[PDB]
C-alpha cells in the first residue's frame, strides 16, 4: 500500500541493492502499519466483547 511517491523514489534508485533494500524497508513499514491496525482492531473488538453473551441470548430471543 505504498504511496505513489514511494514507487517513484524506488525507481529513482539506480543500484540494484539500494532499490532492493528500499523495497524491503517499504515492506517493513507497511507490515508494521498493518500489524498496528490489526492490534488496535483486536483491542477495540475485545472492548466490545465486554458486551456479554446475555446480549447475544436476548438478541436470539428477539
Amino acid at each position: 500500500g505504498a504511496e505513489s511517491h514511494e514507487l517513484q523514489d524506488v525507481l529513482e534508485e539506480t543500484n540494484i541493492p539500494k532499490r532492493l533494500y528500499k523495497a524491503l524497508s517499504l515492506l517493513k513499514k507497511e507490515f508494521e502499519l498493518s500489524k498496528l491496525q490489526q492490534r488496535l482492531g483486536r483491542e477495540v473488538e475485545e472492548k466490545i466483547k465486554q458486551t456479554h453473551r446475555k446480549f447475544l441470548l436476548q438478541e436470539q430471543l428477539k
Binding site: 500500500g1 504511496e3 505513489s4 511517491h5
Partner: protein
Amino acid sequence: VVHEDFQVTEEVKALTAEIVKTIRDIIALNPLYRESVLQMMQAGQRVVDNPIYLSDMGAALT
C-alpha cells in the same frame, strides 16, 4: 465541525475506496437501500465535495 485534512493527500482517499467497497459488499450481501444512489455518486466521479458526509451516509446503512 472538525474536518482536519493532511496537506499531502495520497493515502487519505484509499481508506475511502476501501470503505465504499465495503459498503457495496454489505449492500450486495444484505441489501439496505436502492443502488440508484451508488450509480449517482461515485468516488471517481468527483462530484462528492464532502467526503466526511459520504462516510456519514455510508455508516448510516449500519
